[PDB]
């Protein structure tokens, strides 16, 4: 374990919301779809 410690070292924060914004666009498309449902009466 000491020699593996000496000779090995096993190494290895930002904004992204493309899934949340994809849900945003899907829910607003569903909202205008519900408006289109209410349009036919």
């Amino acid at each position: 374990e000491e020699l593996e410690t000496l000779w090995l070292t096993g190494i290895c924060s930002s904004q992204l919301d493309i899934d949340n914004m994809a849900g945003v666009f899907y829910m607003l498309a569903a909202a205008m779809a519900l408006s289109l449902i209410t349009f036919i009466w």
């Binding site: 919301d17 914004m21 666009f25 607003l28 205008m32 408006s35 209410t38 349009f39």
Partner: peptide, 27 residues
């Protein structure tokens, strides 16, 4: 010792147009 906000702005540009469309459509 950003671009997604511009996408949201284009989205609300769509929103205002479709709200005026529902204003004209719905009695």
């Amino acid at each position: 010792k950003s671009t997604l906000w511009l996408l949201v702005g284009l989205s609300v540009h769509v929103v205002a147009v479709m709200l005026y469309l529902l204003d004209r459509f719905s009695p």
